[PDB]
């Protein structure tokens, strides 16, 4: 706007009009000068007010461009996170037993629901009350899923360790049920 050649034309027209004011020339010459000054105003406002919309459009594109650059930077970060998650789960797989059970399958397809049941090395039993404890995991070893598990730990709802001698019929009220017992395949 203010830097445009049209601004220079308007400025020189205004300077000529002011000089004619200082000159006090005839009305016709002044009237013609006014016509030249006014067309400069329209030309000034023809180019200006397109600058405002020009800069408005440029800013809108730049802000959108900033957004798209940020979008393509979050995509890479989440992709890297997903890759790391998948590979870290891979390193957790018990490959020997998984291979043993999948090689037995005919098509190579086995139901997902048994992949842990026959390959998971650690089992967690959540128990709501004492009767269920006595019926499911009494003692230090128990039998689930046709396997023999040995209880390595027992925690309560507060994640506080609970020694296996504290779980009694009379000591049940003092424990923060449910109890999570963690055992390992034997």
């Amino acid at each position: 706007f203010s830097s445009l050649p049209s601004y220079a034309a308007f400025a020189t027209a205004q300077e000529a009009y002011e000089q004619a004011v200082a000159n006090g020339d005839s009305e016709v010459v002044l009237k013609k000068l006014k016509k030249s000054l006014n067309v400069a105003k329209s030309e000034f406002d023809r180019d200006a007010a397109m600058q405002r919309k020009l800069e408005k459009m440029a800013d809108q594109a730049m802000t959108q461009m900033y957004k798209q650059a940020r979008s393509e930077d979050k995509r890479a970060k989440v992709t890297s996170a997903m890759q790391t998650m998948l590979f870290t789960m891979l390193r957790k797989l018990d490959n020997d037993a998984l291979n043993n059970i999948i090689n037995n399958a005919r098509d190579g397809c086995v139901p997902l629901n048994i992949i842990p049941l026959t390959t998971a090395a650690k089992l967690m039993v959540v128990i709501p009350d004492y009767n269920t404890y006595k019926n499911t995991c009494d003692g230090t070893t128990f039998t689930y899923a046709s396997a023999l598990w040995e209880i390595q730990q027992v925690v309560d709802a507060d994640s506080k360790i609970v020694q296996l001698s504290e779980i009694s019929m009379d000591n049940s009220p003092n424990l923060a049920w449910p109890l999570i017992v963690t055992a390992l395949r034997a």
Partner: protein, 529 residues
């Protein structure tokens, strides 16, 4: 998944002492009042999530009668004939709110915005077209709901993954947004209760039924007892609009994806994957509309049972006797649809059993003479149908019957109805439960909503909702609107005081002067706009 199970609790609501003090100073909450607090923020211990997921044990494997379901399907589809649907490109799907969670495991890395931005349209159509010839099992979390309620049982919602919602939107959204843009149909979704919308709904329900009687039932454990066969039926009725866009294998694999991600899929309930026995998950991409299709299915099955189980020699109207004869013939003696009779029975139902369905909540305007004779479903028919197609007993103490239309349905969408005078005519206005509005004012679910002066739009919206109470005959009911208006006035006064102390100049153009005048709200229940 983790080495230690996670126990999730629910915190109690944050008391809004200023509003409660104002109310008790305005003569509310007195002993023996008709407007007493009943809606509170109930808290739950660590056994909330898993003692509420355990209610899926009410979902038994139900084997629906097939020669009758394959006719209820035709009628229910006739109910969905005004609409149009199909597949849409990834660049036509419009998400409402993009900051909502993205299920599991995607919630670890961002909201739904991250995955709707990271994925171009080309690789969105790629995933969608991948699902049309492949099955993508998916995990859905069970999130505990922190909201005001009238009963202490925990409320749980199934947060479905983004890999499922993206494709289900691309699949269903055309039909789903055509349902929400049609007025005067059976499924009133997308119809507002403002600007004379409630009156229009209640007067399209009365679509010229001879001896009207209003009825409303209730599904106990609607989303946890819905059989798998009927959820599959709803998903297949919603997918009859892809007669051209999709082939048949494409449609079957889309149905398989819906069943694998919604119906019976792995549920992550506090750091542990369980198996969902069945029943609709109430957070998938099509939950209100699928349940609407279910509700119409149950209504039509009740009608069929009521019409067939009728003696047949007692039926005096010789047209209805022949209609029953042909109904039995078309159920248990034909293997191919009989579209002429399907149209005839659909016309019969809409002439004597006008319905209005919102996603589980129905108001019917059934003919009374036929219902007494037994030629159309009544409450006992619905109870029987629910007993043998849901494995739940629908107690008659929660389903209402209204014999006088001049006071509208007893309760639809938790809004009672009342016939008031506006201008020169009479209109039906919905008013809520006053205890609900009072408990929404008193118990906010955050500590910054307790300040008050920050949240005047909260009370403006609550007053918009509670305006109809002013026209109630019970004065203690009508006092709630004026309580809210006076509290808004006090909030604005003390807001101006605080902002005139924090500075030396008050707001130049404070146009809050219209929120404590009844005209602004009075204009919200007038048909003009």
């Amino acid at each position: 998944l983790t080495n230690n199970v996670a126990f999730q609790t629910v915190k109690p609501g944050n008391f809004n002492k200023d509003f409660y003090d104002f109310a008790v100073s305005k003569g509310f909450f007195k002993e023996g009042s008709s407007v007493e607090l009943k809606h509170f923020f109930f808290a739950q211990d660590g056994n909330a999530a898993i003692s509420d997921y355990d209610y899926y044990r009410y979902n038994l494997p139900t084997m629906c009668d097939i020669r009758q379901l394959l006719f209820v399907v035709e009628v229910v589809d006739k109910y969905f004939d005004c609409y149009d649907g199909g597949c849409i490109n990834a660049n036509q799907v419009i998400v409402n709110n993009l900051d909502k969670s993205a299920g599991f495991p995607f919630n670890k890395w961002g909201k739904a915005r991250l995955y709707y931005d990271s994925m171009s349209y080309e690789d969105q159509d790629a995933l969608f077209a991948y699902t049309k010839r492949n099955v993508i099992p998916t995990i859905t979390q069970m999130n505990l709901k922190y909201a005001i309620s009238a009963k202490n049982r925990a409320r749980t919602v199934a947060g479905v993954s983004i890999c499922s919602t993206m494709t289900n939107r691309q699949f269903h959204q055309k039909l789903l947004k055509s349902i929400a843009a049609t007025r005067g149909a059976t499924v009133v979704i997308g119809t507002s209760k403002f600007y004379g919308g409630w009156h229009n709904m209640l007067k399209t329900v009365y679509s010229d039924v001879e001896n009207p009687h209003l009825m409303g039932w209730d599904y106990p454990k609607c989303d946890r007892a819905m059989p798998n066969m009927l959820r599959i039926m709803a998903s297949l009725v919603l997918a009859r609009k892809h007669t051209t866009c999709c082939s048949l294998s494409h449609r079957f694999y889309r149905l398989a994806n819906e069943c694998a991600q919604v119906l019976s899929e792995m549920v992550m309930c506090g750091g542990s994957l369980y198996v969902k026995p069945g029943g609709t998950s109430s957070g998938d991409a099509t939950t209100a509309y699928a349940n609407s299709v279910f509700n119409i299915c149950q209504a039509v099955t009740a009608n069929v049972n009521a019409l067939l189980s009728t003696d047949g020699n007692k039926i005096a109207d010789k047209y209805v006797r022949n209609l029953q004869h042909r109904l039995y013939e078309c159920l248990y003696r034909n293997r191919d649809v009989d579209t002429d009779f399907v149209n005839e029975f659909y016309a019969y139902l809409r002439k004597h059993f006008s319905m209005m369905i919102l996603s589980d909540d129905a108001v019917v305007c059934f003919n009374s003479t036929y219902a007494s004779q037994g030629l159309v479903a009544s409450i006992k028919n619905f109870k029987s149908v629910l007993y043998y197609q849901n494995n739940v007993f629908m107690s008659e103490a929660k389903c209402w019957t209204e014999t006088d239309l001049t006071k509208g349905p007893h309760e639809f969408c938790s809004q009672h109805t009342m016939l008031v005078k506006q201008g020169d005519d009479y209109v039906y206005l919905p008013y809520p439960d006053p205890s609900r509005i009072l408990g929404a004012g008193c118990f906010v679910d955050d500590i910054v909503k307790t300040d008050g002066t920050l949240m005047i739009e909260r009370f403006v919206s609550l007053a918009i909702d509670a305006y109809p109470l002013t026209k109630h005959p019970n004065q203690e009911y009508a006092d709630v609107f004026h309580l809210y208006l006076q509290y808004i006035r006090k909030l604005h006064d003390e807001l101006t005081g605080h902002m005139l102390d924090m500075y030396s100049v008050m707001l130049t153009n404070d146009n809050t002067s219209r929120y404590w005048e009844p005209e602004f709200y009075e204009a919200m229940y007038t048909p003009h706009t």
